[PDB]
Design a protein around this ligand. Sequence first.
Ligand SMILES: [Zn+2]
Lengths: 121, 116, 71, 94
Amino acid sequence: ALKTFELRKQSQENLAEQLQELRQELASLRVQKIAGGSGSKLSKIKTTRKDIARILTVINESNRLAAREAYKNKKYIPLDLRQKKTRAIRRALTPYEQSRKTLKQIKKERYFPLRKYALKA
Amino acid sequence: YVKTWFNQPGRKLRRRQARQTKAAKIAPRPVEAIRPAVKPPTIRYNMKVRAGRGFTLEELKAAGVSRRVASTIGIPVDHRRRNRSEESLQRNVERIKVYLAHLIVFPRKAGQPKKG
Amino acid sequence: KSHTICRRCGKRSFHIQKSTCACCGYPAAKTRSYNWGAKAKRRRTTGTGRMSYLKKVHRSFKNGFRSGKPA
Amino acid sequence: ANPRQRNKQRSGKPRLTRRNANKKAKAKIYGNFVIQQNWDKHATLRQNYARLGLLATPNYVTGGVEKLYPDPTLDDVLDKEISIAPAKTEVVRQ
RNA sequence: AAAACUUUCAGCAACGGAUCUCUUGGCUCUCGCAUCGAUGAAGAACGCAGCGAAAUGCGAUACGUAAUGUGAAUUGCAGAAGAAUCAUCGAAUCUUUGAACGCACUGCGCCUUUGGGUUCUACCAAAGGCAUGCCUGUUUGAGUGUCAUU
RNA sequence: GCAGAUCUUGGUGGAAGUAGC
RNA sequence: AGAGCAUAGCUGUUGGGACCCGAAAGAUGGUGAACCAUCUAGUAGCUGGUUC
RNA sequence: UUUCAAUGGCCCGUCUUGAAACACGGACCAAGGAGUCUAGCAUCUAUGCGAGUGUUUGGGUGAUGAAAACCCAUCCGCGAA
RNA sequence: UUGACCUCAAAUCAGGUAGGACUACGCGCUGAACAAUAAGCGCAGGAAAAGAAAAUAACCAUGAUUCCCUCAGUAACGGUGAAGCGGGAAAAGCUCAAAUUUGAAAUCUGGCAACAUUUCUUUUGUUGUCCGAGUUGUAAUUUCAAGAAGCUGCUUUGAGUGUAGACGAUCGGUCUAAGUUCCUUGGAACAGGACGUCAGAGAGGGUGAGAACCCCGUCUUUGGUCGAUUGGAUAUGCCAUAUAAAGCGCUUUCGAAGAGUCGAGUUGUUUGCAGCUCUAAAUGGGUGGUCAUCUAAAGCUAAAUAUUGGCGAGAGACCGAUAGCGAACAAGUAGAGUGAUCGAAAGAUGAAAAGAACUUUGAAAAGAGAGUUAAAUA
Ligand SMILES: [Zn+2]
C-alpha cells in the first residue's frame, strides 16, 4: 500500500496519472475474482480501494489548499472555504459587535468602573 | 401535578457552589452588597428593623458618597426610597459611614497622555 | 389498489386521487404529526434513522467546533 | 428507551462520555493574588474569609453559625469621622 | 373371578416449562451541560461489506480516507507487518430523495463555459449554474410625473 | 399468602382417531 | 392557681382512579354512514370476585 | 402406603331463601390476580418537651457517599387569653 | 432641451436572510367533552417569560422582576379562592421620543486598495479613498432618580498594542502498594488450614467456585508532569487625536415628558382582553385612603426559577424474563390493515466445543456400537 508521505511530494498531473492505473487494476481484479479469485484477490482489491482513496485524498487536499491560498485576504470566498460550525453560530453577533457600546457608556466605565475592594472584619 | 422536593439537598449544594464560584471571581470583596436598615410598612411590624433594597440619595449625600461612586464600591442606591424622618436618615448614614471605615479600595491604573 | 409509495417517507400511504400521503402529509412542506399519535410519533421521530449529520455535530461540540490542522 | 437513545445502544460507536463529576471540590481562587496564596482549598468561603480577617457579608447571616469550641443625635452621626479600622490579620495588613 | 378392559398405586420413559439461581435490560431519583437546517437538516430510498443470519458501520474515497495516539494485531473465516473489525479526531469525501430549489416527477429543459474528434463553423458530452418571498446596495430603462429650461 | 372473578397468559386432556375430507 | 405543641402508630371518616373486574358513550383530531388515535383509569346505588 | 371388612358420608363457591329449592360460576394444571399510596379531619395510645411547643422555606456545615448526620439567624403556625 | 428629484419596473447583477425538524420545560392563539382541560394552530431559547412602578400602603412607612415559605384554605365569592405585609434565594441597572451641532452631519452601510488578526489560510477587524444613506434628521447631549446652560475649585481619566510570569477554566497524553509461598478437596483454588505482605488502596469488575496482595482498576488525585486552546487580573515596554472628557459644588438663567390612546356607551370571549359607536386633558392623568402615592399609551436587561426532550454522569430498602419500557434477543422488528394506525412471541450446553472422529444399519432422516467431559441425570 502506497504511503501518504511520498504521495504528497509530487505534482497533480502525475498524481492523477496514478489514479487510472490503480482504477483499471482494481477493475481488472474484479474481472479475475468473478472468474475465480483467491483470498489474495480479495485483499488485493481491499488494499487497492484504500490505495485509491489515499491518493484521492491528497488530490482533494492539495486542490482545496490551492483554493485557500488563492482566496486568502479576499473579502468574499466560496462557501466551501468557509466555517461551518452550526447555522446559529454563523448568525450570532460577532464578538466585536457584541462589545460595541455608546459613547455614553464608554464614559461610564472610564470614570466609574467597578472597583476592587475588601471589607475589614 | 404533584411537585416533589427530591432535589432539595441538590439545590442546597448548587447554591453553595455558586457562592464559592462567585467568591473565586471577586476574591476579597464581600459576596453581598451592604443593605440599608428600614422599618416594615405596617402597624404590625413598624417596630422591627430589617434590611432594605438600597440607600437613598439623601443618605448618600450626607455620608459623602456620590450616587455614581456608590455603585462601584458595593453600595446599592434606591432612587425610590426617601427619608421622611431624621432617624431613618441617621440610622443608615451611620451604616454607610461604618462601611467606609472598614473598606479598602484598591487603586486603579489610569491612562495618562503625555501633554495636555 | 388505493395507495402507492411516497416520495418523502416511502411508506405505501400515498393516495392516488388526492395525491396526498396519509402518513407524512406529502406534498405539504410540514410533516404530518399529531399530539394524540404518541406511538406514531415514536415510529418516525429523530433517532429512527441514520442521524448522519447530527451525530457529527454532537461529536464536534466537545472542542468548540474547531477547524484547522494540528501542529 | 427512546429511539434516539436505543440507537446508540444498538450501535458500535462509543458514547461521548465526559468525566466531569467532581463534587465537594470548591472553586479555585483567582482575581487577587494575596487572597489566593493565603486561601486554603478545604475550608468554606465563610471559614476562609473569617480566617483572613475579611467580611463575607456586610449584613446579617440568615441562619446559625458554627460553634466548634466552647467560649471561655444627628450632629454626632453627620459631623463625626470614624477612625478607620485596625487590621486583624497579616493578610489584611498585606 | 385370571386375560382383555376399567380403576388405584409405584417405577421408568415422554410431554410441558413451573421453580430456583442470574442478568451488557428496564424503572425511578439526583447532578453537569447547551449543540439541527438552503454551507441542504430530521426522515425516506438505493447501494458498499471476500462470506457475514440479521443487525451494525459506511457512501462510488462506500463495515471508510487524512492526521494524531497507543504499538502488533485481525478472527466465525479471511486478510495486512505502523499492523488493528482499535482509540482519538481540527483535514478531505459524503449516491437518489426530503424544507428540496431549472421545469416536471417518469422525463423534458434553458443559458454559459470547457473540452471532444478517428465524425472539429456545428454537433455531442461533461462541468458550472438556473426556486420563491423579503432586506441593503449596483446597473439599466421607462413615466401619464415635479420642475429646471429666453 | 388464592380454588373460584362465563378471571389473564401458557401448557394439556376427555369428546376422538369421532365429525368428516 | 392555664395543658398544650410536635412526631410516630392504631382506628374511623372525607377527597382524589381509591379494593378489583365490570354499562351505550360523548367530545377533539385524523383515515378510506364506516374506520383509527387520544381525552379515559369518563360515568356503576348494580354484577361477579376479593388470597394465612 | 396399598387394600379389605364393619359403620357413616348428597358438590364446592356465590346469590337466593326461615330454610332449602334454586339459578348461577367450575374440563384440568402452572404462573399472575384485587382495601394501595397520598392530602385533610377526629378519637385513642406511645414518645419528647411543657405555658409553652414545632431544627429540615432557608442558612451554616459535613474530606472516611456529602441527597445522610450535625448545627440554628429571622419569622411564622398552634396554644396560653 | 440638456439636467436634477420623485416614482414605476427590470437584471441567470453583488451581498444576505426566511422556510423544515425537535418541542421535556417556555410564550402566544384557539377549544369541546368528561376548563385556559386534551386536541388544533403559531413562535423561541439554554432557559423562556417577567422586569427597573401610571407599584403597595395608611405605617416610625415600603421599593424592578422571578422563585420558595408564610399570609391561608384566610378575605372575597358562590365549593371555588387570592393578595399587601412578613421570612428566604438572588440582586443590576438602564436605553430612547419629546431641546438648534447650527461656529460648520460632528453619524452610518457598501465598493476598492493596503495593513492586520484567527478556535480558523475557514475568523474578525483597522486605515485610506470613492460611492451611497441621511437634514422628511444620522452622531454628541438628556430620560424626571432628573437634566440643560452658566459660574466655581476641588477630585478624576485608555474601546490602543506587545512581552513576561502567576492564578483559573477546557481538551488530550503520562506517572502509581502489596503472595499467586506450603498442606488438603476439586476438572479448575478464587475454598479450607498454615505462614506472610500492602493499606491515603479492604470500591467494583474480570479471571476454570467467596481474590485487598493474578489482572484492570481503587487510594494518593481537593495532584505531580507534558502539551494544546483559552478567561480575568498583575508587572512592564511602547503608543496615546488631552485645544479633550467627567463627578461634586454653587444659581439675578432654563427645564421639552409617548392619542383612535386614556376615558364613556354597548356587544362578545375568558376583572383583564376583543369588537363596534363616540372620543379627550395639562399640576394634567392613573390607582388608592381633601390627602397620599404613582407618571401609562416606546424599548432593553444577568442572577435566583423550570425542565418525562437533547449530550453525558452518578446512584437506588425499585423489577428480576407472564416482572420491569411494547421491546434484556433480528423490537417499533416480524406480522396485520386500502389507509390512518396496530404490533408481538422469543434470555441460560460446558471451565473449555473438547459440538460426538471411527465402524455399522438405512433411500434418507436418524439408529446402534463407540468416543469427549467432573457431569451427556449438560
Ligand atoms: Zn409520505
